[PDB]
Amino acid sequence: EEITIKHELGETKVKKKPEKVVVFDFGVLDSLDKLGVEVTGVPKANLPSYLEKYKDSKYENVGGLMEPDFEKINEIAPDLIIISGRQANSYEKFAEIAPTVYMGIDTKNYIDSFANNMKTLGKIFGKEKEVEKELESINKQIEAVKAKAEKTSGKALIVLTTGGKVSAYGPGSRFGIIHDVLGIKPVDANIEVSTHGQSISFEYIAEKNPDYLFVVDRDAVVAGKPSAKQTIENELVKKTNAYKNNRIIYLNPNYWYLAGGGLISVAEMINEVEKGIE
Numbered sequence: 001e002e003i004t005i006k007h008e009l010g011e012t013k014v015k016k017k018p019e020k021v022v023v024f025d026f027g028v029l030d031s032l033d034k035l036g037v038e039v040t041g042v043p044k045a046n047l048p049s050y051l052e053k054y055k056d057s058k059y060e061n062v063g064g065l066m067e068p069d070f071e072k073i074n075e076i077a078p079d080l081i082i083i084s085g086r087q088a089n090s091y092e093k094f095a096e097i098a099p100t101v102y103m104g105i106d107t108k109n110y111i112d113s114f115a116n117n118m119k120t121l122g123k124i125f126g127k128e129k130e131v132e133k134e135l136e137s138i139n140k141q142i143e144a145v146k147a148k149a150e151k152t153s154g155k156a157l158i159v160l161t162t163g164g165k166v167s168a169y170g171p172g173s174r175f176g177i178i179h180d181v182l183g184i185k186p187v188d189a190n191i192e193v194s195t196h197g198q199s200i201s202f203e204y205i206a207e208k209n210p211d212y213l214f215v216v217d218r219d220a221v222v223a224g225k226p227s228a229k230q231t232i233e234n235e236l237v238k239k240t241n242a243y244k245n246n247r248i249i250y251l252n253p254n255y256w257y258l259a260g261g262g263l264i265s266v267a268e269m270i271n272e273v274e275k276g277i278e
């Protein structure tokens with residue numbers, strides 16, 4: 001029951017309800033988890049906390065997000081590989097082995113992107129009704145949080161910590177959902193969209209004086225060693241209202257950084273934003 005998927009990187013012909021599925025996007029992984037779809041292989045080295053069960057010996061280990069074990073993947077001979085942004089460079093290597101579908105998020109159209117990705121999984125796996133109900137559920141979350149947000153304002157800055165350094169994200173970025181979808185006003189509308197964020201001094205933060213400081217601890221999930229609290233909470237940042245009002249919201253990097261774009265991760269992300277602004 002073959003179908004053809006158009007995607008950012010080409011057109012892939014895929015068997016419906018494939019037996020062996022290898023997944024390199026944790027958003028997809030958590031989506032397939034949510035829909036009760038069994039996967040064969042995952043990159044166990046970078047599995048998020050909330051997806052720890054895919055460490056089990058019943059799943060094949062296909063390496064790291066940034067370090068696919070191509071030989072192992074070959075030995076599995078999957079019916080479908082699903083990849084996203086971190087593997088885009090390696091699309092052709094995956095595609096040589098087995099039908100590969102790229103599922104990225106368009107940060108200019110986050111929800112549309114996400115919904116199309118989830119509906120593609122709906123088609124592939126015969127989970128259209130299930131996908132639809134989850135999308136409608138998320139829509140009701142977006143709805144309620146927008147309404148909270150649109151009550152009294154103050155502006156937010158989104159930051160990421162790694163190796164003592166701090167970088168920023170605004171609208172239309174990797175974390176743009178906060179501004180773009182959930183109606184939280186940006187402290188700076190014009191932050192340059194890059195993968196690991198626009199580098200910034202602590203003087204920029206104090207200067208912008210956000211009411212909310214959203215923080216993503218990258219080192220927690222990349223190096224296994226949290227450092228965000230220790231980086232962020234310095235002289236210049238304690239000037240901030242976000243500090244003085246205890247509105248430094250540490251976003252769970254297991255969801256936000258390693259994952260995202262999945263039925264579980266997007267609902268958790270929205271819930272964390274809601275808590276943060278309550």
Ligand SMILES: O=C(NCCCC[C@H](NC(=O)c1cccc(O)c1O)C(=O)O)c1cccc(O)c1O
Nearest residue numbers: 046065066084085086087088195196221222257258
């Ligand atoms: O293309 C990507 N990364 C290329 C540069 C990797 C640099 C390298 N990064 C990591 O070790 C890393 C490990 C696991 C997950 C990650 O997102 C990482 O960036 C470093 O810290 O020197 C990428 C794409 C989408 C989202 C990301 O977080 C990416 O890192």
Ligand SMILES: [Fe+3]
Nearest residue numbers: 086195196222
């Ligand atoms: Fe990264």
Ligand code: NI
Nearest residue numbers: 069070071072
């Ligand atoms: Ni190996």
Ligand code: NI
Nearest residue numbers: 071072073075
């Ligand atoms: Ni081998």
Ligand code: NI
Nearest residue numbers: 132133135136
């Ligand atoms: Ni509907």
Ligand code: NI
Nearest residue numbers: 192193194198
């Ligand atoms: Ni640049």
Ligand code: NI
Nearest residue numbers: 243244245246
């Ligand atoms: Ni106070």
